[PDB]
Amino acid sequence: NPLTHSTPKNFGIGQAVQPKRNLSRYVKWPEYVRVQRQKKILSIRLKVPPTIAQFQYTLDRNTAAETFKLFNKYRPETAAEKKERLTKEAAAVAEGKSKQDASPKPYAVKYGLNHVVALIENKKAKLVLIANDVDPIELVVFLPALCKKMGVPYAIVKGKARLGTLVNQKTSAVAALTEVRAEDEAALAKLVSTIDANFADKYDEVKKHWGGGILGNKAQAKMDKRAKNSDSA
Amino acid sequence: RPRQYATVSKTHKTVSRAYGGSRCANCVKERIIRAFLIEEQKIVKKVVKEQTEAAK
């Protein structure tokens, strides 16, 4: 409506040098990026066995939230309160002279792979969380089989980093409750019911099932045009 | 020689048209003529295409 004018650009072939478009699909990424992406792809494409891919069936987010609430109640000690209780115990050994009777029993969460495996073997663990992570997967593939052989409820949860956050490390790869105060036993039992429904009770069919065999979107479309309209329409 | 064009002023290195010390005057004339006439025939192609396509 002013003097100002419209000059539309014809961004067709053979005229009007093209505009800046999003080219994230065509960038020459670095080699570590391509390694990890193609590693994801390849592990998806190949027929994975059953004992791997008994992972990939991690725990739902609501159940996981409840689980991590329960565990974050029974977080471990840190250096600050450890030094606090060390002071308390150095005092009590002087005044009370009561060794291993000043501080109460801790009900912390048990972590560490060798520790937790030994606990599972001696049947002292009441609930075991396992990471869908680790890359040296041999560290953790044998744990469902153990928990099943020994009668322990196990759950494959997402995040060794979650486990590390609750247990005051970066990564843990496992976590376990053996002892629990007489206030959360009912919650723990509810969790065990859900978890055994999802993981331990499905263990036979999961042991039978073979994973992977997935195709790319391009190849899947090629299949869905090839095998579709051989007799479809 | 090339680095003397830096010593010398600009009236020595350019004439007062568009494309002064770069193109000949007759070359400039040709490209002006060409520009104007092709930009007219562009309009003509547009309206011919419109009158043809809008027939149906």
């Binding site: 072939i13 053979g14 040098v17 093209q18 | -």
Partner: protein
């Protein structure tokens, strides 16, 4: 014995090509979006001599679709193209001399040159003076195209393989008697050190298998196996026939 001429050519110290005055490599434009969905227009600016090459070259100038600049390309000139001519390259380009089309888009009987073996190599076949391939059929299923090459061989190429329309210029070159050793000298001092050629029969036995003798003779069959090895391959290699060619060859 001693290492022979044909052996040490491969080390190629003084047998490298002489490439100073060559204007560049004759390459088709990179196969990109325009050239595989539409056409792109270019201008022939120069038609220029290329040393060590009887065929002339065309300096064609195109626009870059993605950045404001002019990208220049070096085509082999088809016979008939001229300065100030527009060159159209792509899938939807018209059938005119100098244009770069896919061999599926062209029809049968079409005469092309600088034609890709497989898409993207930017020209491999029918590139020397006077040469062309003929298209002699399409197989539109599996997008192939059967063609006659200047040797007489039939080949099957992708329909997406591009080819420039017409015959390459410089034809008639080998009709003229070169007529003197100096002209052969000047020919080859712009190509490589392949000239003059001495005969094995004329040299000593260390220097060649045909060498030696109280007469100039070979002594053994000059036809030598494909399974011979380097130093033993200095005649007619894997010769399935020999002698004056009589009658119809290209038997099929």
């Amino acid at each position: 014995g001693r290492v022979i001429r044909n052996q040490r050519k491969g080390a190629g110290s003084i047998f490298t090509s002489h490439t100073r005055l060559r204007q560049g490599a004759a390459k088709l434009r990179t196969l990109d979006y325009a050239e595989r969905h539409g056409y792109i227009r270019g201008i022939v600016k120069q038609i220029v001599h290329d040393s060590g090459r009887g065929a002339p070259l065309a300096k064609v100038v195109f626009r870059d679709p993605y950045k404001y600049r002019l990208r220049e390309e070096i085509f082999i000139a088809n016979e008939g193209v001229h300065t100030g001519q527009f060159i159209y390259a792509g899938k939807k380009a018209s059938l005119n001399v100098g244009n770069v089309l896919p061999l599926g888009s062209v029809p049968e009987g079409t005469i092309v040159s600088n034609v890709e073996e497989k898409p993207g190599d930017r020209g491999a076949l029918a590139r020397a003076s006077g040469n062309y391939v003929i298209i002699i059929g399409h197989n539109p299923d599996e997008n192939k195209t059967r063609v006659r090459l200047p040797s007489g061989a039939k080949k099957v190429i992708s329909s997406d393989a591009r080819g420039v329309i017409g015959v390459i210029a410089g034809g008639g070159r080998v009709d003229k008697p070169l007529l003197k050793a100096g002209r052969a000298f000047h020919k080859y001092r712009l190509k490589r050190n392949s000239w003059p050629k001495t005969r094995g029969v004329a040299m000593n036995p260390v220097d060649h298998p045909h060498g030696g003798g109280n007469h100039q003779h070979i002594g053994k069959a000059s036809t030598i196996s494909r399974g011979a090895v380097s130093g033993q391959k200095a005649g007619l290699i894997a010769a399935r026939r020999t002698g004056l060619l009589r009658g119809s060859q290209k038997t099929q």
